[PDB]
């Protein structure tokens, strides 16, 4: 493995409204970290033990929390780390056809167990030209991902899940699907009788996303849309307007949602909003761990700010949130 990692990170300062850059080092022999300042050439923090940080979470484009600061990994600061990550930078596409929508959560969980990082995801319907050329169905899920020894790892999906996955490795086809599947365009989200569930960034980094989606499928709900979006601070504020003055952790929720990318799903069922609220559980994980031990927030939540998932509370706002996620963010 490694003896010392080295990354340079940026930290968005809310009080100053500047972006500061530091140098983060991780010693893997005894799990200690240390931070330096690039602009001043001075020490920011000694070697201190930090057990919540693990070598598996260290990759480019990730987010970590060190003493109540959100640090985003930007670039390699050393050539040892650059050589160790010489691979793991090529982007490939794995499709899920119509027969595999029922097993998509297990597919995503299997990808996470294989040390693969998902860089985008969407539920789309492709044009007929790419449909014929690639060999996929009309309605499919497109997953974009990267990682070490990627092609040899994804070969196992052919025997675990027969005849529901298509793997793409040629760069030209990847460019075509990147231009076509993602980017500005239409959406498959409905505008009535729907609910929206949002997977928070901390659950994204920890990776319980496949279990959440598969639990939703198992309970009987239907997924009508899915995508990943990155929220700015103003976007996070406009998403949580109704929670201002009502809950005590408004600002912490704002910074958590603006920390990193988040997954947003849409659920359609009978009495969708109440059913999703019942399956997610109460807002506080402490109540869940005592009275509602089977809920999602009991397994994937630690406090009110980081309860794992977010669900619509008022039935008057479900099309509003669905529109905000699947039209305003997606199209522009």
């Amino acid at each position: 493995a490694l003896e010392r990692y080295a990354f340079k990170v940026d930290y968005c300062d809310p009080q100053a409204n500047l972006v500061r850059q530091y140098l983060l080092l991780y010693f893997a022999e005894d799990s200690t970290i240390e931070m330096h300042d690039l602009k001043t050439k001075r020490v920011f923090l000694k070697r201190c033990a930090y057990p919540s940080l693990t070598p598996r979470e260290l990759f480019i484009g990730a987010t970590v929390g060190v003493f109540s600061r959100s640090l985003k990994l930007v670039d390699y600061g050393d050539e040892v780390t650059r050589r160790h990550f010489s691979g793991s930078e090529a982007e490939f596409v794995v499709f899920i056809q119509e027969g595999g929508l029922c097993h998509m959560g297990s597919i995503i969980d299997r990808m996470h167990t294989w040390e693969l990082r998902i860089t985008n995801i969407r539920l789309v319907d492709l044009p007929d030209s790419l449909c014929r050329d690639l060999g996929v169905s009309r309605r499919c899920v497109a997953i974009l991902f990267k990682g070490s020894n990627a092609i040899e790892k994804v070969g196992g999906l052919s025997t675990e899940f027969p005849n529901m996955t298509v793997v793409v490795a040629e760069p030209s086809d990847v460019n075509s699907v990147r231009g076509a599947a993602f980017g500005p365009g239409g959406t498959t989200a409905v505008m009535k009788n729907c609910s929206v569930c949002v997977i928070k960034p901390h659950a994204i980094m920890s990776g319980y996303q496949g279990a959440i989606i598969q639990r939703l499928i198992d309970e009987g709900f239907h997924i009508t849309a899915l995508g990943m979006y990155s929220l700015t601070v103003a976007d996070a504020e406009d998403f949580l307007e109704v929670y201002n003055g009502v809950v005590p952790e408004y600002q912490r929720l704002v910074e958590q949602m603006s920390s990193g990318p988040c997954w947003a799903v849409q659920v359609c069922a009978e009495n969708s909003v109440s059913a999703l609220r019942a399956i997610c559980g109460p807002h506080d994980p402490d109540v869940c761990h005592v009275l509602f031990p089977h809920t999602i927030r009991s397994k994937y939540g630690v406090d009110r700010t980081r309860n794992g998932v977010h669900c619509t509370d008022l039935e008057e706002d479900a099309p509003l949130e669905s529109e905000f996620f699947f039209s305003l963010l997606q199209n522009a």
Binding site: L23, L25, H36, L38, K41, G77, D78, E79, V80, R83
Partner: protein, 442 residues
């Protein structure tokens, strides 16, 4: 922060090679003075600064001069493996040796070379911002080491003044001997060393041979082993300057704690986990065992027995994974012992230091790898026995003027022998007087 090393003559240069090998390997500077082209992170660290300065291209070069009157040893350094580490101006060599004559080094030959040394040291001292002492390595048995070492220490002491000067000195062993004229040179050296040094560390080759025979399993030791042990000791003492720790010790704290009166500055040195790799897997090495070890006379690097005297002060340096409570429990256990005695005017006999960096392992070395070590420097009245035997050998030779015609021909008055012998007699009487107990009646 900074310290300047001055290496004189054959023993001092050869011990210097081992010291700079170790300091390079501990910081990680390659023998060509650079660092690995890959390990660079963008913002380096100050720990080298005690011993190295960097050029604008990032090469490292060390804060040392190598001084000799014969070329051969310095030419070995110039043609060896470390050719690129040293600056060539720093390596100063004369034409011909001082031929075991203190007079030849001091009066005739060293007088030409001494001004280059002062110019190099000045050029070093101008490129500093917190110089805090000189470290000097030499042997007093030979002519150039004694004579030029004394002359250079006198000049340094006038020019730089208050700055501290700590000497590591190889004295003539009590029955192993290498040259006939050793007593004369050692007496004449010691006369100058009394006035112009702040702490003097004592070494005997016979003790380091004994230590390498009993603890290590070496039947046929050679000078490289002794020099590696000395280098390890110096690295342990200077580690307090270079790495983070619980209880730091600045070089002025050694002099403040160890020296009670301005003449009583000669100290004994010892080192605990000298052990081979095969022994290392049969034994645990906790703090209390090595603390008990450092007080046994089998651990000492000078051939003197401390049971024939009284301790005045001890300085214990712990490096590695040690916790202060174990140091306190160990020192209290040592204090309990009946064969360890302190003078009654020194109730608080100990100074402690604790540093986190464990001792380094050298590729060709003979010491095992260990998580902790302790090094001791201590002031004791037993040292008076070391001087008395040299004085007896001087008296035996001087009764017949056995070799004096060389010294008088090379420029010295016969009177200088008697002056030095009287000064060492007064030093012996100082160690007799300081150890007494008075005002018992109250």
């Amino acid at each position: 922060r900074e310290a300047i090393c001055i290496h004189i003559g054959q023993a001092g240069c050869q011990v210097g090679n081992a010291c700079w090998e170790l300091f390079c390997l501990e910081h990680g500077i390659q023998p060509d003075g650079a660092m690995p082209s890959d390990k660079t992170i963008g913002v380096e660290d100050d720990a080298f600064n005690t011993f190295f300065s960097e050029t604008g291209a990032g090469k490292h070069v060390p804060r040392a001069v190598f001084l000799d009157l014969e070329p051969t040893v310095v030419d070995e350094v110039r043609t060896g493996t470390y050719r690129q580490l040293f600056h060539p101006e720093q390596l100063i060599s004369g034409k011909e040796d001082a031929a075991n004559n203190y007079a030849r080094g001091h009066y005739t030959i060293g007088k030409e070379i001494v001004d280059l040394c002062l110019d190099r040291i000045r050029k070093l001292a101008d490129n500093c911002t917190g110089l805090q002492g000189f470290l000097v390595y030499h042997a007093v048995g030979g002519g150039t080491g004694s004579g030029l070492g004394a002359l250079l220490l006198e000049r340094l002491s006038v020019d730089y003044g208050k700055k501290s000067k700590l000497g590591y000195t190889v004295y003539p062993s009590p029955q192993v001997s290498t040259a006939v004229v050793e007593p004369y040179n050692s007496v004449l050296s010691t006369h100058s060393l009394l006035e112009h040094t702040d702490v003097a560390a004592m070494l005997d080759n016979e003790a380091i041979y004994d230590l390498t025979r009993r603890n290590l399993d070496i039947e046929r030791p050679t000078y490289t082993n002794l020099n590696r042990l000395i280098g390890q000791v110096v690295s342990s003492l200077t580690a307090s300057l270079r790495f983070d720790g619980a209880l730091n010790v600045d070089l002025t704290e050694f002099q403040t704690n160890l020296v009670p009166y301005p003449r009583i500055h000669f100290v004994l040195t010892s080192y605990a986990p000298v052990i081979s790799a095969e022994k290392a897997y049969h034994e645990q090495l906790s703090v209390s065992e090595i603390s008990n070890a450092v007080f046994e006379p089998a651990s000492m690097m000078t051939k003197c027995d401390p049971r024939h005297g009284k301790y005045m002060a001890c300085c214990l340096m712990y490096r590695g994974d040690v916790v202060p409570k174990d140091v306190n429990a160990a020192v209290a256990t040592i204090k309990t012992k009946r064969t360890i005695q302190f003078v009654d005017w020194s109730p608080t006999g100990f100074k402690c230091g604790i540093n986190y960096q464990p001792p380094t392992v050298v590729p060709g070395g003979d010491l095992a790898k260990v998580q902790r070590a302790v090094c001791m420097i201590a002031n004791s009245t037993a040292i008076a026995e070391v001087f008395a035997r040299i004085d007896h050998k001087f008296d035996l030779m001087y009764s017949k003027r056995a070799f004096v015609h060389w010294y008088v021909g090379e420029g010295m008055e016969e009177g200088e022998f008697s002056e030095a012998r009287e000064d060492l007699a007064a030093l012996e009487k100082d160690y007799e007087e300081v150890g007494a107990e008075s005002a018992d009646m109250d």
